[PDB]
């Protein structure tokens, strides 16, 4: 089964090219990678082209798939954009399993007003009946994981930058909310407290 | 006599996992179609089991990553389940295989996800499905034989 | 059952798979160059070329090495080393002829010039190096075995109904409590704990290092004479925690006799004792026949994996000499006991107590030679601090013989934000103050990062003060590791002294596709041959660029191990792709192994190929004899070439046919160009 | 005597990139990357033999041959650490007095080289591992 490098790429703008290591660990296994990228709405896009689309893995071996823009700077350059690189492992009765792997591609603007590693505290939770609607005004796309109210797991949160996504809060749950988001090498952030900001 | 000082400067990078399904080629295999039991459409066969492994990868990255099937559906009311993709003379008529969850549940083939409630194993991370044959009308002494798409969003 | 089945070891490669290498020669130099102005003698000039050959034909290794000195007043070129080394697989063993060391860790060091047969650990997978406990065990019925550490698994596998030997652990460090947890399908599961600490001189259970050494002896002395001599060393790892270790050094003056058990007694932790016998005739007529006799302890983890403590003893009767001491001239006190206390602890997270004491008595000088060092390093955040305090008081009359040190780091990053495009993030302060307990002081503070894209460009300026004298000493370094080469150049001011140094090393490999440079060697060599792609800078390396013909040298390479080499597509023409970006390669200690990369150098074009108006189907190969180039059909008819001429031809075969095509230049200019074309 | 060669006294070595598949359980090491310390003056008749001991702080006490890597604004690796080996491929043990093989001091520039590895103390989980050490040479 093939593997990627990492489980976030992000693509700085100004660049050209961004490289994604895609390895084959089972020695004895011939497979045919078809690679691509789609907006944040799951709508196949012309705006990043990966390199080479459809090639051929034999046995054990390790490719780099080259992530060429094409936004012409149309793009936004106050926040991130988020895009879905999606890597399809075709293993060129019984039926056959074609594993996509998906992977969040963040489009980043050069200059930001805020460096990455403040964006994380600065999130404030709105609370209502039914509702924990996180609030995000730091322009970076936040992965709100183990969201404890108190006592209870709500779920996996991805708010926008400067926006709200909303959740639903089971009145049983505590005052107290905990919660810890994802950096951006994968690790996960020492679990901070929220505020009702 | 005395000297200075060395630094090391590196990074680590977390790893997406690998994704093993089942046996070699990503094949799971299935008992053949039987003419008489693939009657009428509530009609079943033997549920196969199978498991999907998320190996070569830490425990939290995988626990964290949904998980979804997807492929083409025979007909529009057969949502959950997948049409045959055989052209030769062993195609068969009005026959699929559906892919289940841990309950029995019939899980749906649009490309809905879930989360992965990842088992650790032993050895790493792994899913449990299973799969099974679903007469649709009649059947037809042949290989059956479908192709599903596994999503794997890393979150 | 699993002891019955060849079970292979983590990380393990066939030796049918190592690379021997390629026949070519090999050149590494190093000039370096000082420049002395002071005051009172004007100026001068000190020139040192050292420069090793070499030539890598079969598996044979040949090396030689060569030193020129310059004052100025004359040229002397001075042989140093040279030897012929092989790697023999059958033996897992290493061969040298000529001159070297022996690595005798039971006897001590000797250089010498002769034959040495001695087993290499490098050729072991890493996970069956070092010592680690081997687990036996029987199981009833299938069941899963998780070995587990005192923080988290390590080797968790299925063992049938049967017996089982697992070998795989890893080191672990120098103590651990591993826990064998047996789960059985059917019955209850069943856990036993072992406790291990380790000694160098401890092996693994059936494991084996023998190592036959004969021939001259050589020594840099003058005094010292050359004389014969044969050496052998044994070193094997007994079942149940033993090892039995021994050795003999002959000669036509000395034999020397050594043996030796080790034994790993669990939470106790571990122990090694050993006798060598010497019959010694000193550079006199007189003989002296001896015995001394090497005790050494290591202490588990006390308290919860706060302290260790090692204790090495050793006492050398009277009329015990090393070969040293028989080899010395034919005109020209002993040991009568060392003790060696090293107690480490540590605190906080943060700070890492180490003491250590030595004192050895000899034979009729009462006179004692202690020494207590005093260390404690701490890293509060990025802040890295270390105070340091030594004692010497030595038989020759060294006095108190005191020393404080204090050293601290402090990376500018503390104050930079994380996202900084600014060239000071990488960069620290040094700072360090010297007291000799005198009133003698050293202040030394300072800069000192890297300030190129690569981060080739590592620059350092330090001031600082030597004081009672007060001299105040200016201190500046660049050096840049490029891809033809290493060249560093340095200012050393001082109140009358300055001093300008500068130097070159590089590499030079005489390979079949002709010579090729870059930064000095380092034993094994991995040659990346990619033409048509110059100007591409490798992966994981700091300034190994491929030069204009494709061709770079790595300077180093695992031996006997899995590495990566990649290309960085990032920093490459646009007019270049690679076929493939990474390779592997397993070299063989000293070998030349080549990294090949397949580039085309054509535009790179994206094809929507439509036949009979109906796009092409998955999986067809779309091929092109003009340029040699080939690729698959996406979907929708679309393919991607790498490497095509501006107008061409070519041929799609679904399971036979012709796509004509034309570009202007400015798509040629164009870095990815996206055309289509209709197929016949 | 001698001393340690301009630009050898602060040095930095970029060990690279390294994945948690290289570095997953307890004891997994990384690729080797070279470094070598250089001495210049250094004649055979004053100090015919030298040989180096790294100070620096270990990680945790029952390995204290892997040094501790600093903590990080953005994010710092947990349960890894920085090992230094030698010539013979043996790891050092970082305290002040143990030091390593020793050497014979060629007459003029005289390199001993090193190699810095990596090696986990357990699952390794992702982020930037910045570590220190601080040599000194002894003379014989």
């Keep these: ?197 | 006599v005395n000297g200075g000082t060395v630094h090391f400067k590196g990074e680590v990078v977390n790893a997406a996992c690998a994704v093993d399904a089942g046996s070699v080629d990503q094949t799971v295999q299935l008992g053949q179609v039987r003419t008489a039991s693939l009657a009428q459409e509530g009609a079943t066969s033997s549920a196969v089991g199978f498991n999907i492994q998320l190996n070569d990868c830490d425990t939290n990255v995988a626990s964290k990553a949904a998980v979804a099937f997807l492929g083409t559906a025979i007909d529009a009311g057969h949502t959950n389940v997948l049409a045959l993709q055989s052209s030769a003379a062993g195609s068969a008529t009005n026959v699929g295989v559906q892919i289940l969850d841990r309950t029995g549940a019939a899980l749906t083939l649009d490309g809905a996800t879930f989360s992965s409630e990842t088992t650790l194993n032993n050895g790493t991370n792994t899913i449990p499905f299973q799969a099974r044959y679903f007469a649709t009308g009649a059947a037809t002494p042949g290989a059956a034989n479908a192709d599903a798409t596994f999503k794997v969003q890393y979150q | 059952p699993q002891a019955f089945m060849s079970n292979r070891a983590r990380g393990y490669i066939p030796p049918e798979l190592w690379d021997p290498g390629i026949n070519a020669g090999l050149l590494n130099y190093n000039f370096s160059g000082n420049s002395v102005q002071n005051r009172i003698g004007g100026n001068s000039h000190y020139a040192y070329l050292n420069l090793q050959s070499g030539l890598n034909i079969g598996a044979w290794r040949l090396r030689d090495n060569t030193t020129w000195s310059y004052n100025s007043s004359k040229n002397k070129w001075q042989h140093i080393n040279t030897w012929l080394e092989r790697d023999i697989i059958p033996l897992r063993s290493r061969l040298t002829l000529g001159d070297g060391y022996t690595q005798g860790d039971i006897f001590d060091g000797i250089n010498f010039r002769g034959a040495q047969l001695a087993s290499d650990d490098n050729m072991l997978p890493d996970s069956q190096r070092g010592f680690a406990p081997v687990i036996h065990g029987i199981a009833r019925g299938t069941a899963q075995v998780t070995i587990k550490q005192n923080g988290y698994d390590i080797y968790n596998s299925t063992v049938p109904p049967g017996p089982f030997t697992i070998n795989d652990i890893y080191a672990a460090g120098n103590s651990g409590d591993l826990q064998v947890t047996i789960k059985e399908a059917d019955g209850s599961t069943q856990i036993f704990t072992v406790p291990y600490s380790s000694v160098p001189l401890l092996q693994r259970e059936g494991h084996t290092r023998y190592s036959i050494t004969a021939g001259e002896y050589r020594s840099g002395n003058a005094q010292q004479e050359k004389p014969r001599f044969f050496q052998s060393t044994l070193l094997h790892g007994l079942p149940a925690g033993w090892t039995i270790y021994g050795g003999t050094q002959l000669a036509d003056r000395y034999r020397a006799f050594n043996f030796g058990i080790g034994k790993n007694m669990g939470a106790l932790g571990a122990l090694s004792v050993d006798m060598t016998q010497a019959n010694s005739t000193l550079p006199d007529d007189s003989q002296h026949d001896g015995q001394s006799v090497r005790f050494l302890y290591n202490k588990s983890l006390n308290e919860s994996g706060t302290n260790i403590q090692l204790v090495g003893y050793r006492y050398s009767t009277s009329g015990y000499f090393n070969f040293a001491d028989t080899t010395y001239s034919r005109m020209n006190y002993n040991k009568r006991g060392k003790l060696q206390l090293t107690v480490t602890q540590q605190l906080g997270r943060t700070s890492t107590l180490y003491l250590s004491g030595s004192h050895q008595t000899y034979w009729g000088t009462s006179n004692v030679d202690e020494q207590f060092q005093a260390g404690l390093n701490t890293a509060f955040e990025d802040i890295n601090w270390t105070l340091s305090y030594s004692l010497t008081k030595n038989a020759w009359q060294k006095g108190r013989d005191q020393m404080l040190a204090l050293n601290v780091n402090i990376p500018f990053s503390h104050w930079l934000r994380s996202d900084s495009k600014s060239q000071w993030r990488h960069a620290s302060a040094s700072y360090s103050m010297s007291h000799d307990l005198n009133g003698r002081m050293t202040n030394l503070a300072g800069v000192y990062g890297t300030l190129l894209e690569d981060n080739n460009l590592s620059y350092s300026v330090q001031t600082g003060y030597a004081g009672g004298n007060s001299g105040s000493t200016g201190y500046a370094t660049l050096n840049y590791r490029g891809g033809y080469g290493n060249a560093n150049i340095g200012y050393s001011h001082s109140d009358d002294i300055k001093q300008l140094y500068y130097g070159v090393s590089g590499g030079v490999l005489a390979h079949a596709n002709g010579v090729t440079l870059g930064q000095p060697l380092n034993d094994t060599v991995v040659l990346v041959k990619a033409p048509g792609a110059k100007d591409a800078k490798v992966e994981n390396q700091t300034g190994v660029r491929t030069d204009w013909r494709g061709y770079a040298v790595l300077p180093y390479a695992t031996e006997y191990r899995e590495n990566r080499v990649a290309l960085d597509t990032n920093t490459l023409a646009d007019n270049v792709d690679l076929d493939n970006a990474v390779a592997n390669v397993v070299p063989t200690r000293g070998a030349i192994v080549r990294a090949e990369f397949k580039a085309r150098v054509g535009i790179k074009l994206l094809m929507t190929l439509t036949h009979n108006n109906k796009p092409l189907p998955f999986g067809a190969m779309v091929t092109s004899e003009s340029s040699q180039s080939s690729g698959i059909v996406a979907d929708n008819g679309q393919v991607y070439l790498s490497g095509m001429p501006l107008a061409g031809k070519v041929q799609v075969k679904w399971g036979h046919c012709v796509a004509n095509y034309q570009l202007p230049p400015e798509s040629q200019q164009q870095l990815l160009t996206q055309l289509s074309a209709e197929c016949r």
Excluded at chain 1, 86 to 109: E, F, G
Aim: a positive charge; proline letters at 7%; glycine letters at 6%.
């Design chain 1, 1 to 197: 089964g093939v593997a990627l490098g990492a489980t976030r790429v992000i693509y700085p703008a100004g660049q050209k090219q961004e490289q994604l290591a895609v390895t084959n660990n089972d020695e004895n296994s011939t497979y045919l990678i078809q690679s691509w990228v789609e907006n944040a709405d799951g709508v196949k896009d012309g705006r990043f082209i990966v390199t080479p689309p459809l090639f051929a893995m034999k046995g054990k071996k390790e490719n780099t798939l080259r992530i060429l823009d094409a936004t012409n700077n149309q793009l936004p350059q106050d926040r991130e954009s988020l895009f879905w690189m999606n890597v399809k492992a075709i293993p060129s009765n019984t039926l056959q399993l074609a594993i996509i792997s998906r992977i969040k591609l963040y489009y980043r603007p050069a200059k930001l007003a805020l460096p990455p590693d403040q964006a994380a505290e600065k999130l404030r939770f709105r609370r209502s009946a039914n509702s924990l609607t996180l609030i995000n005004p730091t322009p970076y796309y936040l992965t709100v994981t183990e969201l404890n109210a108190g006592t209870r797991v709500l779920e996996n949160a991805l708010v926008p930058p400067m926006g709200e996504s909303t959740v639903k809060l089971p009145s049983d749950a505590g005052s107290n909310i905990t919660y810890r988001t994802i950096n951006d090498y994968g690790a996960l952030t020492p679990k901070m407290t929220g505020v009702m900001e």
